[PDB]
Amino acid sequence: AKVNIKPLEDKILVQANEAETTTAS
């Protein structure tokens, strides 16, 4: 699931997010 499903993509993204995830949370 999300886990193995882009586990880093959520760790390398959150970065460009600042802590959000994708957009304004």
Side-chain angles (χ1 to χ4, degrees), residues 10-24:
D10 266 35
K11 335 268 162 184
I12 60 77
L13 285 182
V14 151
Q15 334 214 110
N17 296 268
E18 102 184 318
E20 296 215 290
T21 152
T22 294
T23 65

Side-chain angles (χ1 to χ4, degrees), residues 3-14:
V3 42
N4 240 258
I5 292 338
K6 288 287 153 103
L8 266 140
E9 125 172 301
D10 266 35
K11 335 268 162 184
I12 60 77
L13 285 182
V14 151

